[PDB]
């Protein structure tokens, strides 16, 4: 999509070419270590529920 926009910017047969959508953003991933959770004897279902 970015490459296509780059091509369309210099085309001269299109007055304006834009992309409809939302921009990419930062996401935070929490990585539940499952064996560490098992060491505490905590069901993964409980963690998911909380």
Residue 35 makes contact with another protein by CB under 8 A: yes
- Is there binding between residue 47 and another protein (CB under 8 A)? no
- Does residue 43 belong to the site contacting another protein (CB under 8 A)? no
**Among 4, 5, 17, 38, which residue sits at the site for another protein (rule: CB under 8 A)?**
38
Nearer to another protein, 10 or 31 (CB): 31
How many residues does this entry show for the chain? 50
- b/e sequence 1-29, b meaning 16+ C-beta within 10 Å: eeeeeeeeeeeeeeeeeeeeeeeeeeeee
- Contacting residues toward another protein, per CB under 8 A: 34-35, 38
């Amino acid at each position: 999509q970015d490459e296509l926009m780059a091509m369309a910017a210099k085309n001269k047969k299109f007055y304006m070419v834009w992309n409809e959508g939302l921009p990419q953003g930062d996401n935070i991933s929490l990585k539940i270590d499952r064996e560490k959770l098992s060491a505490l004897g905590v069901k993964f279902s409980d963690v998911s529920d909380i």
